[PDB]
Write a protein that binds this DNA or RNA. Structure first.
Lengths: 275, 312
DNA sequence: CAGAGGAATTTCCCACT
DNA sequence: AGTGGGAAATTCCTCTG
């Protein structure tokens, strides 16, 4: 059977922000989803079903089909003309990539951006030319691994290209990471009504909400668009909890939620107390 | 003796500078007296007048050594950075309206500055301090399109160079210069220039409007140390402080300052502090006081908000 | 030092009356 | 429309790890 590429460490979906050329060479690498504050992972693949020599190429493609070459660029070790191409270390069959960086393009110099992709023949999915002219979501991209091994006869057999999870630019509020930074109170009674000042990262009044959860219970904070202070702070009212006579502290979860993406932030923790 | 006098100073705060890219028609510099329905503007007057006189106004720095500024005055009556008018009737009071301060870019300061220093030496418009000390040559007899030499241009550069580094693109000052008719012909009798109050760019972080939009709590124990969230307009963490204060009866004033660290300022739009101890922690009834934001640098403050201190 | 985060600069755009 | 103001885009800088 034909050998295949397998992604064992997806790139983290949010948090990293696409960096402009001017911000320098030391912009950073894109981290793996399974990464964290303690552990620092990186996109990794396994070419299970082959360990010999070969070559690997990585590039950027749009989020939605047809997966056409993206105007942004990958920069870092072994990158050129916007793509990464190097030889697969022949020792192990598991390969990780810790020097991948995304370099966004000035909205201006976009026309030439699609040009370089063309003129350099990147097209991992050979999408017809008429397809790659339209608009491009400059906040969403996906990694594409075009690996190349060798058949028994010793000839180069390029495998099927694989797409990783999407990577959203953090410098865009609607595509960015949600995060509750601090709260002026985290108690409130089990009958709701308590007011809270919540400080968070850039959000948008039209597309945001405070989601309260707990087993067998779901509710939302009450607040209005005017209560969203400069995209960085929200003042809202706690909702009524399940048990009206909830004697004995009950600890629920409170998180930020964006309707458009249905995305949620890591929980904050809150306790509904009796009375 | 003839002398220029400033009738109405420039406003000073609340006027935003505008980049070339923003185009015009965004607003004109208002007089220090600007009002509700009524609008004022910079105003000067030539004393012990001299028939018809020529008046120019240029932008200059706010440093100890007054120099030419890189931004430029635009609007009707302006050209190449300097505004020009002329009061020749029996009327000696000219006013400058619809003036705009063009915000040059950091990477265009030198180019613009230099070309601004020469045009001055040529027109002979105050190269006294404005550019070179001993370049006092031609106090106005610079001659229409009378070329310069290399005995000053090499001197200019050494100036436009060191100055480009000390320029504060955040503030400027207007300098008025009057010229009178001498030995018939035209204007060459310079009347000793005058500098206006400094004008602060409202879009600059170090001069934005200080304000308190909202507070989660407006009362606290005289003991102090109680946490409060304050929602405000853009401020700088290393240059902002919260001042509680109470005016006495003996013309005295007590003050306290919210306690907090820069890390306690959320994206310049909010501050989390702990209240200060009130004057006397032994009061029996609640004592009303005021709270206000204040910028360490300009000592510039915001409108105040009432705060109620109460017993333990 | 590299590079996460925070800000400062520059550009764009959108209510109004 | 010209004002007045906000937002975005793009660049720069500071401290962390």
């Amino acid at each position: 059977h034909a050998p295949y590429v397998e992604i064992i460490e997806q790139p983290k979906q949010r948090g990293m922000r696409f960096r402009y050329k001017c911000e320098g060479r030391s912009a950073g690498s894109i981290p793996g989803e399974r990464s964290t504050d303690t552990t620092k992972t990186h996109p990794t693949i396994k070419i299970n079903g082959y360990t010999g020599p070969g070559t690997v190429r990585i590039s950027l493609v749009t989020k939605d089909p047809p997966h056409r070459p993206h105007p942004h660029e990958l920069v870092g070790k072994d990158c050129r003309d916007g793509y990464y191409e190097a030889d697969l270390c022949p020792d192990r069959s598991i390969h990780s990539f810790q020097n991948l960086g995304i370099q966004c393009v000035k909205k201006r110099d976009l026309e030439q951006a699609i040009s370089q992709r063309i003129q350099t023949n990147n097209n991992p999915f050979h999408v017809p030319i008429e397809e790659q002219r339209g608009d491009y979501d400059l906040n969403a991209v996906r990694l594409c691994f075009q690996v190349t091994v060798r058949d028994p006869a010793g000839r180069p057999l390029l495998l099927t290209p694989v797409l990783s999870h999407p990577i959203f630019d953090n410098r865009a509020p609607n595509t960015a990471e949600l995060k509750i930074c601090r709260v002026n109170r985290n108690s409130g009674s089990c009958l709701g009504g308590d007011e809270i000042f919540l400080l968070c990262d850039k959000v948008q009044k039209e597309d945001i909400e405070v989601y309260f959860t707990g087993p067998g219970w779901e509710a939302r904070g009450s607040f209005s668009q005017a209560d969203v202070h400069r995209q960085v702070a929200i003042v809202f009212r706690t909702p009524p909890y399940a048990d009206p006579s909830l004697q004995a502290p009950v600890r629920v979860s409170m998180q930020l939620r964006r309707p458009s993406d249905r995305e949620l932030s890591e929980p904050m923790e809150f306790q509904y107390l009796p009375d | 003796g003839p002398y220029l006098q400033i009738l109405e100073q420039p406003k000073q705060r609340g006027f935003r500078f505008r980049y070339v890219c923003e185009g015009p028609s965004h607003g004109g510099l208002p007089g220090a007296s600007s009002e509700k329905n009524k609008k004022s503007y910079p105003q000067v007057k030539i004393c012990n007048y001299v028939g018809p006189a020529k008046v120019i106004v240029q932008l200059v720095t706010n440093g100890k050594n007054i120099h030419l500024h890189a931004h430029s005055l635009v609007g009707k009556h302006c050209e190449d950075g300097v505004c020009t008018v002329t009061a020749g009737p029996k009327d000696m009071v000219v006013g400058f309206a619809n003036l705009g301060i063009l915000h040059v870019t950091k990477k265009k300061v030198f180019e613009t500055l230099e070309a601004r220093m020469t045009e001055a030496c040529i027109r002979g418009y105050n190269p006294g301090l404005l550019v070179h000390s001993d370049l006092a040559y031609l106090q106005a007899e610079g001659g229409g399109d009378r070329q310069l030499t290399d005995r000053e241009k090499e001197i200019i550069r050494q100036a436009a160079v060191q100055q480009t580094k000390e320029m504060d693109l955040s503030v400027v000052r207007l300098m008025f210069t009057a010229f009178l008719p001498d030995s018939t012909g035209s204007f060459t009798r310079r009347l000793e220039p005058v500098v206006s109050d400094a004008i602060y760019d409202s879009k600059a972080p170090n001069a934005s409007n200080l304000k308190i939009v909202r507070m989660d709590r407006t009362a606290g124990c005289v003991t102090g140390g109680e946490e409060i969230y304050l929602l405000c307009d853009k401020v700088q963490k290393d240059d902002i402080q919260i001042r509680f204060y109470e005016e006495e009866e003996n013309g005295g004033v007590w003050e306290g300052f919210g306690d907090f660290s820069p890390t306690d300022v959320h994206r310049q739009f909010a501050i989390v502090f702990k209240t200060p101890k009130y004057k006397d922690v032994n009061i029996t009834k609640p004592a009303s006081v005021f709270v206000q934001l204040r910028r360490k640098s300009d000592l510039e403050t915001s409108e105040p908000k009432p705060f109620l201190y109460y017993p333990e």
